[PDB]
Scaffold this motif. Structure first.
Motif, PDB file in Angstrom:
ATOM      1  N   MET A  31       1.082   5.352   0.718  1.00  0.00           N
ATOM      2  CA  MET A  31       0.567   6.510   1.434  1.00  0.00           C
ATOM      3  C   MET A  31       1.187   7.791   0.906  1.00  0.00           C
ATOM      4  O   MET A  31       2.321   7.803   0.423  1.00  0.00           O
ATOM      5  CB  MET A  31       0.818   6.416   2.943  1.00  0.00           C
ATOM      6  N   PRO A  83       0.830  -1.210   0.000  1.00  0.00           N
ATOM      7  CA  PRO A  83       0.000   0.000   0.000  1.00  0.00           C
ATOM      8  C   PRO A  83       0.861   1.255   0.000  1.00  0.00           C
ATOM      9  O   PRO A  83       1.942   1.295   0.591  1.00  0.00           O
ATOM     10  CB  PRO A  83      -0.813  -0.123   1.294  1.00  0.00           C
ATOM     11  N   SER A 108      -0.259  -5.598   7.292  1.00  0.00           N
ATOM     12  CA  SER A 108      -0.315  -5.671   5.842  1.00  0.00           C
ATOM     13  C   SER A 108       0.694  -6.703   5.346  1.00  0.00           C
ATOM     14  O   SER A 108       1.355  -7.389   6.130  1.00  0.00           O
ATOM     15  CB  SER A 108      -0.061  -4.295   5.230  1.00  0.00           C
ATOM     16  N   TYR A 156       4.351   2.225   1.931  1.00  0.00           N
ATOM     17  CA  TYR A 156       4.663   2.109   3.354  1.00  0.00           C
ATOM     18  C   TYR A 156       3.872   0.947   3.935  1.00  0.00           C
ATOM     19  O   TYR A 156       2.670   1.110   4.235  1.00  0.00           O
ATOM     20  CB  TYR A 156       4.337   3.410   4.084  1.00  0.00           C
ATOM     21  N   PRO A 157       4.476  -0.222   4.111  1.00  0.00           N
ATOM     22  CA  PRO A 157       3.746  -1.370   4.665  1.00  0.00           C
ATOM     23  C   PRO A 157       3.487  -1.189   6.151  1.00  0.00           C
ATOM     24  O   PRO A 157       4.403  -1.271   6.975  1.00  0.00           O
ATOM     25  CB  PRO A 157       4.690  -2.547   4.383  1.00  0.00           C
ATOM     26  N   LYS A 158       2.228  -0.944   6.500  1.00  0.00           N
ATOM     27  CA  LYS A 158       1.839  -0.787   7.890  1.00  0.00           C
ATOM     28  C   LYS A 158       1.759  -2.153   8.567  1.00  0.00           C
ATOM     29  O   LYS A 158       1.887  -3.202   7.930  1.00  0.00           O
ATOM     30  CB  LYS A 158       0.503  -0.057   7.990  1.00  0.00           C
ATOM     31  N   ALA A 159       1.537  -2.141   9.879  1.00  0.00           N
ATOM     32  CA  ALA A 159       1.384  -3.384  10.620  1.00  0.00           C
ATOM     33  C   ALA A 159       0.111  -4.099  10.186  1.00  0.00           C
ATOM     34  O   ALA A 159      -0.938  -3.472  10.008  1.00  0.00           O
ATOM     35  CB  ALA A 159       1.352  -3.107  12.120  1.00  0.00           C
ATOM     36  N   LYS A 187       0.071  -0.256  15.168  1.00  0.00           N
ATOM     37  CA  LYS A 187      -0.583  -0.644  13.925  1.00  0.00           C
ATOM     38  C   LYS A 187      -0.304   0.361  12.818  1.00  0.00           C
ATOM     39  O   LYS A 187      -0.138  -0.025  11.657  1.00  0.00           O
ATOM     40  CB  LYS A 187      -2.089  -0.774  14.140  1.00  0.00           C
ATOM     41  N   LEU A 188      -0.249   1.651  13.161  1.00  0.00           N
ATOM     42  CA  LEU A 188      -0.011   2.721  12.201  1.00  0.00           C
ATOM     43  C   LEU A 188       1.471   2.963  11.946  1.00  0.00           C
ATOM     44  O   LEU A 188       1.846   4.051  11.492  1.00  0.00           O
ATOM     45  CB  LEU A 188      -0.678   4.012  12.675  1.00  0.00           C
TER      46      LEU A 188
END
Lengths: 729, 729
Positions: free
Chosen positions: A206, A204, A229, A224-227, A626-627
């Motif tokens: 951002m 994903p 993903s 930016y692979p977040k938690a 998570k973010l």
């Protein structure tokens, strides 16, 4: 009677940015076994020879005319020089820009350009191991030039802007695990090249807002692979630097529990053999594998697994010239107090029946890095915290069965205790650097005599500068909790009197795998208000600090934001018993991940002895893991996306309910990439819901790591102005 | 006796939002000369008749049942009632939600949906003039139903989301020029509908950032035409409500200086002839034109041109039953002291050579708006500031050559200076509201007897609340400069003394064409810190304020933030000469454009007598109007894109470079569509380059107008928390 003191001027923030404090560290590197590059000291580039006091001149003050070339490097044949100049990095260190070639004596600057392209921005060119052959990367495309006049060869161009990377790391690898902007490795013969292809198409993307560009500014998108993903795809490939330039991809291990993999280390065992470390997505399974560059067949050489995760996966084992037994480092049980990181010797081709594990040393300490090994006998050189976990000292042991450890520094100079070293090709000599707690000390020593032939650099201007003002007193009052000795330091302004009262400041980093209490010379805002505004600062390294046991590292696992919080409250309580310290004027500061911790340290001690902190602050905090990046949240709390039941209570909002009278400030640049502004926005929403009191400050359209000197002066001035307001009464 | 009583209650933040302080409005509207709608006062709705005390029970406590519909209307035949539930405001006023129809007595709900569509939100429905005919707009598409049971018809569906608006205003029209969301007008016979099609295809787009939408929030795009950019293109259309319902458009005037035009005002003059006001993009050339509805042929009627701009183009004309001479408001020269607004009679068909201009009212005063006109004799009612510029009085003049202007309100009630009168169809009875300077009341009166038959409402809760609390003392001290008088209102907590010193706080809005000093009754933060902590609030209408001379209005043409600030320091110096106001405590405040004006009242008055202010703030200020909409910037500064040179001199940055010690703060929501957060961010960037102390707060992902009461009270608490700390000593 006559009480002798400093009785002179103090240290202000302005002098911190003066060139007088600036360290002109040459950072030389051994070109051969007899001499190093001897980089710039005060301008032009010389070339010192260790053998007989020889300092030849290679580059002159012509670098000024090369559009102020920031970086320069010398080809292995010391006949051509690359000068790279740009305006600013991107993520942490994006040393892109314009690359120009110059002759060894002087003159003739030519801008390295990709084919059919005029003078254009170039990410990296670099030098090969031999001759004037080189490569260069443009738009995630690796091209090779055998000579200075050789036309660029379309060696590989499958990379794309922000989707496919080759030879360079994305945000994740450059900022989480690999920590390096360059991700390609030359073979020893200068004939093969190993490069990592990263597929970011699935990641994903951002976009960061812009508020300075134009009347209609546009957002900046990056993946930016977040938690929770999916992590970006990774593959390893090997190409030739001549002839067909055949591409060979390296087959990863295919363990049933290791579906998703990351490459944490690659090293050229030979010109055809490469040692690669592969770590599973759960980060609890690591495998060292030997792969053939010309074949692609990958043979596992080592495997390890831990309940929580694998720490320090970026290390490079010392491989011999002939590919014989190498010297790795890994966690051995080390009896009690958790497993410690020690050096191990492994045969060239260990059998599947058993491993050849053998700890070179032993003890309740760790080896931070292994420098090198001498094939000419029994000499293994490394840096370790053997004397103290807060000190780095150079040690040497014997590869033979005796395993006798020989000192090299162990207080070679009384002023400096921190150490680092870099040996020559034949292990004959080595550069040594102190960088703490005294002025950084650059010197040349020899493994046999262990004597300083001469001073490479000492920065005596720093000496007179630190001797010209009230140098703050440095001391240690280490505490003890559970079965652990928790290090810490406290500072005094050199005019300290036990009778008078001084306000307290706490500074917290608490990054899992880091250490904030080390004997490295550093000057920051802390000294700025200690020397001038009269404060006492506390640096503490609670549980989860590295280099003090894997058990200590994994204590905070699945308990983030809980245990170290108790550690710092305990440190505050211990120092609060001091009669010379003020209880009413107590402040806390943090930044990066520690900034999150800084937000979580706003308590009401009991109910009667409350109001623990007067003014608080935090810079780029993290509110919901998570973010944040997946490789961090998954590492320290488990993989998200399956209701991990660990990211809810760790959100600081549930703890920021009270915020009775604490003066709380947030510093956050708008365009942060490491720690997105969304964390600050969520925290602000929580504050509004909680009727809280705060004062936000923002840096519009600025990178996270914030590499501008004048802006840094502005930031530190704002910090001290905020802190002086709450300490004044 | 051993007892006594202390001082009574003061006003705090909770008091403003307390239920007792809520204002009750019946907002009754005439259905005929005999009865009015008599809308909600405290629950159920009656149908009151003026003639003999006949309040027919029409609406009861079933409005709660339909999920608490915020807004509701009654069909013109008084047989169907429309509720709008689950309605949320997008812009300043965008009544998007769910519409349900029901029988007049009670019960039997019926959802209003377009064909083949389930439960979906509707932006606006409205009602027709007769029967049960109505319309509704879905996806910017107008669907009309002659009957409630009539199936919805695709009357027009060319509208696009955010590109093509029919029947509803865009951002620019709802905010800056048209000042209303609705954009459809019913014909007097209810046979044809006039709607404006706004095309945004050639309009620039801006993406508002989102920081709370999800784990992966994305920007929301909307068309915000900046200064000098391409404005939305407006066309006008008329759709029949019978037969083929073929649409017809009216051609605008083709003046060469008027290439780009807007529809500032439109009103059905008759059932077939409609009056439309078209204004150039330069907003200095306006033309009123009468056009056939069933043909679209436009015949120019009146023109108005000024060197600076035109003002109050929204003024609705007064037409007759036969479409004869109509009433207009024009800035006639009026001899000296500049031109003034006065009523003008224009014949039904003025000759092409010269018109039939004839002014009715005269004097150094203006008519705010013409209430109504009676064909049965000579009675034109309107509101005007003839008494004082800070008061509104009802005046009735005669169309006959005598022109006798009769004041009817004058002093009907002692505690009523401001007035709002709404007359019936036959004008015999009207509804009068006070709205200050005390508690407002609504009453029924007759223009003949001026007799209060009964009181519609008195706001007893408001009276008891103001009796139970320390009402601030209202007084006026007007100033004079050049040929302009600038009224001012200083407030006291009703317990003023001389022994104490009262901290000074200025409040400025100063929007051109607006009035900031008036005798209206209001409760806000000013009331709070005057009551809670006695900070004297200073409000003055400097240069740029309307209703006091079109010369004063045009004085700041291209000279924004230059003369009003002079008048403001003049007022500050005049007030501060009183001893009971101290020098240390001086504060400024503002919002929107006034916030920018607030930023412009922090100079260094000389150098000996420095420190002009102590604590200053703003609410989403503007520092460069290029970053603002064209309809506001071009009106006062001219069209941009040709280096107008009247924009770049308006920047407050150079004026806030010093900021040695004055505290400075900004309040700004993230999604502020009125004044973008980009303004604040660029201000912060300059301040960082300016190197001055500041503060800032954020409301992430909310509109500018604070539609939720919780956000408003949080804002007020934040303001008071800031202003208390900067004064107490």
């Amino acid at each position: 009677e006559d009480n002798s003191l400093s009785q002179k001027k103090k240290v202000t923030v302005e002098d911190l940015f003066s060139e007088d404090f600036k360290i002109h560290d040459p950072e030389a590197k051994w070109i051969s076994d007899t001499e190093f590059i001897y980089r710039e000291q005060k301008g032009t580039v010389r070339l010192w020879n260790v053998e007989t006091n020889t300092s030849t001149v290679l580059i002159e003050g012509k670098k000024i005319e090369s559009l102020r070339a920031i970086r320069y490097e010398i080809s292995p044949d010391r006949e051509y020089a690359l000068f790279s100049y740009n305006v600013e990095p991107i993520y942490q260190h994006s040393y892109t820009g314009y690359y120009v070639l110059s002759k060894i004596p002087h003159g003739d600057p030519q801008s390295l350009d990709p084919p059919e392209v005029s003078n254009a921005k170039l990410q990296y060119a670099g030098w090969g191991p031999k001759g004037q052959q080189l490569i260069f990367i443009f738009e995630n495309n690796i091209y090779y030039c055998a000579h200075v006049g050789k036309q660029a060869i379309r060696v590989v161009s499958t990379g794309k802007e922000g989707v496919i990377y080759n030879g360079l790391s994305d945000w994740l690898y450059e900022e989480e695990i690999l920590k390096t902007h360059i991700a390609h490795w030359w073979s020893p013969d200068g004939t093969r090249l190993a490069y990592a292809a990263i597929n970011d198409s699935r990641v994903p993307i951002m976009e960061l807002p812009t508020y300075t560009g134009s009347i209609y500014p546009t957002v900046k998108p990056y993946h930016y692979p977040k938690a929770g993903s999916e992590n970006p795809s990774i593959s390893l490939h090997v190409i030739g630097l001549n002839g067909p330039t055949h591409d060979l991809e390296m087959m990863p291990p295919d363990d049933p529990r290791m579906r998703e993999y990351y490459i944490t280390m690659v090293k050229w065992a030979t010109s055809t053999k490469v040692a690669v470390t592969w770590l599973n997505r759960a980060q609890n399974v690591s495998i060292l594998t030997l792969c053939d560059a010309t074949t692609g067949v990958c043979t596992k050489k080592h495997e390890d697994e831990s309940e929580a995760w694998l720490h320090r996966q970026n290390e490079e084992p010392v491989f011999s010239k002939d590919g014989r037994k190498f010297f790795f480092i890994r966690a051995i049980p080390q009896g009690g107090r958790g497993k410690f990181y020690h050096i191990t010797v492994s045969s060239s081709q260990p059998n599947s029946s058993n491993d050849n594990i053998q700890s070179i040393t032993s003890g309740d300490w760790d080896v931070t890095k292994i420098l090198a090994y001498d094939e000419k006998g029994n000499k293994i050189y490394f840096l370790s915290t053997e004397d103290l976990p807060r000190r780095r000292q150079l040690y040497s042991a014997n590869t033979v069965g005796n395993f006798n450890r020989q000192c090299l520094s162990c207080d070679l100079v009384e002023n400096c205790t921190y150490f680092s070293a870099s040996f020559s090709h034949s292990m004959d000599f080595f550069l040594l650097k102190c960088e703490g707690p005294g002025v950084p000390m650059v010197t040349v020593h020899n493994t046999t005599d262990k004597k300083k032939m001469f001073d490479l650099e000492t920065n005596e201007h720093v000496k007179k500068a630190i001797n010209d003002r009230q140098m703050p007193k440095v001391e240690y009052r280490d505490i003890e909790i559970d079965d652990y000795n928790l290090p810490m330091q406290i500072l005094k302004p050199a005019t300290f009197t036990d009778t008078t009262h001084y306000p307290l400041l706490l500074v917290v980093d608490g990054t899992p795998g880091s250490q904030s209490v080390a004997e490295k010379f550093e000057v920051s805002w802390e000294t700025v208000m200690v020397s001038s505004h009269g404060a006492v600062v506390v640096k503490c390294d609670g549980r989860g600090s590295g280099f003090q046991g894997t058990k200590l590292l994994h204590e905070v696992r699945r308990r983030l934001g809980l245990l170290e919080e108790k550690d710092q409250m305990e440190a505050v309580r211990t120092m609060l018993k001091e009669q010379y310290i003020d209880r009413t004027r107590v402040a806390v500061f943090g930044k990066d991940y520690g900034g999150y911790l800084s937000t979580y340290i706003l308590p009401a001690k009991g109910e009667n002895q409350g109001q623990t902190f007067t003014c608080g602050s935090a810079l780029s905090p993290i509110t919901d893991f998570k973010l944040y990046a997946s490789a961090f949240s998954e590492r320290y709390l488990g993989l998200h996306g399956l209701d991990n039941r660990a990211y809810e209570m760790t959100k600081v909002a549930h703890r920021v309910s009270a915020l009775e009278e604490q003066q709380f400030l947030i510093i956050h640049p708008t365009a942060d990439e490491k720690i997105h502004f969304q964390h600050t926005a969520e925290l602000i929403t929580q504050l509004i819901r909680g009727k809280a009191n705060y004062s936000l400050q923002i840096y519009p359209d600025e990178s996270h790591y914030f590499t501008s000197s004048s802006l840094k002066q502005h930031l530190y001035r704002s910090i001290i102005n905020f802190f002086v307001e709450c300490f004044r009464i």
